[PDB]
Each structure stands twice: as C-alpha cells, then as structure tokens.
C-alpha cells in the first residue's frame, strides 16, 4: 500500500469584507429606512437630518 496526503486551499474573500487595511473610512451613524440592505451592496442616502 502507498500512503496519500491531501491539501486544500482557503477561499480568498467573502461578500462585504474589507480587502486591504489601507486608509479606509467607516460611517456608523446611519440608519436603514424602509427596506433591507444586503452586505456587499451599494446604498443611497435619502435624507440627512439637519440637527
């Protein structure tokens, strides 16, 4: 009998994951309005409160 050795490689990325740690900026003072938002998809700003 001849032995065997097996090797598998990891995946590179997931949807919505930050690619490189190179001068990013994150806004966390937003709120989702009237719908659902998937990770890794673009968004839009409807109205920014004045005060």
């Amino acid at each position: 009998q001849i032995n065997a050795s097996y090797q598998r490689d990891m995946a590179i990325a997931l949807p919505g994951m930050v690619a490189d740690t190179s001068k990013y900026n994150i806004d966390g003072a937003c709120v989702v309005n009237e719908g659902d938002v998937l990770v890794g998809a673009a968004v839009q700003v409807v109205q920014a409160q004045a005060v």
Partner: protein
Amino acid sequence: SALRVFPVTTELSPTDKTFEYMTFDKVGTAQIIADYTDDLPLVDALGTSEFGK
C-alpha cells in the same frame, strides 16, 4: 430707600476705576452609533466678560 432696596457690597479699592466679571459656557451633542464608527461628534466650551466703571 435705594440703600435698603438693593444690596451694598465692599469689593473695590478706593483707587479702582474699572471692574470685570466672567462667564463660561459649553456646547456638544451625541448620536446613535454602530460597531465600526469613525464619526463621533465633538464638544467645545466658550467664555465672555463684562465691564463697569
């Protein structure tokens, strides 16, 4: 009766010509944030003064 209606203090020397008094104040706010946020609002303070002869 003007010396009995209002208080009479003793703080100025006989050689003074002007007196001053100060006032201080502050501003600021707060928001609802999430796990990763880089936009926390800031706060500050003020000051002012008045004059008399």
